Amino acid sequence: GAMGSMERASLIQKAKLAEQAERYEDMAAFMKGAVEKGEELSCEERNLLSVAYKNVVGGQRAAWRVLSSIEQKSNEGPEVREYREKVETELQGVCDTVLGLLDSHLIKEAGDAESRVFYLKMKGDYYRYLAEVATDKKRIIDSARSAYQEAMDISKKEMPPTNPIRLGLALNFSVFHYEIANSPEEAISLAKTTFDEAMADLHTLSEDSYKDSTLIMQLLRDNLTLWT
């Protein structure tokens, strides 16, 4: 790996610099290098990994949607299809890279609920991103569902209802149901029960944790407004 010669601590430091500079491709490459040092990641480092790749794939998803819309309108030369395929293939490459890091060997070494749920959620997320462009589609959807479901089972057993990782997992699984799996009723049910159960646990939290939890609860609410 091109980052194999750099110290782990230097890679983490440079990932934080890249974030400040909004250089998310660099940030992802630094965090990939840190993962490949073989040590488990701290909570802070897991978040840096997620921030980096979510911004990279986020730009690719936005571009893919633009090009796909143009392509569908053109079907109401090969260039539009070719360029959409180019972006699609790069997007799939990033998703495969993240999934590879999770499988080699972040998930298998993650024993604590906070890390294991975080990584399984990520696995569901990047299979969901693959599903968005798939037309293998059924198997990709099943892989996302399976990862989300294992994460959900652990989170309900091991985390309080207001835990931001648990909340963000439930949010994304509900989006999976609504956008990917053609299950809007499952999506609404999951979002509502998650919101209500979190509401009832807010009283246990400090001011800072309260802010973290309610931020994600507002996203659940906004989706329920959009879906109903």
Binding site: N47, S50, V51, K54, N55, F118, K121, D125, P164, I165, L167, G168, L169, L171, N172, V175, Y178, E179, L215, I216, L219, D222, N223, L226, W227
Partner: peptide, 8 residues
């Protein structure tokens, strides 16, 4: 639909 922020 809104999905989760990356940092949690």
């Amino acid at each position: 639909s809104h999905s989760s922020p990356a940092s949690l």
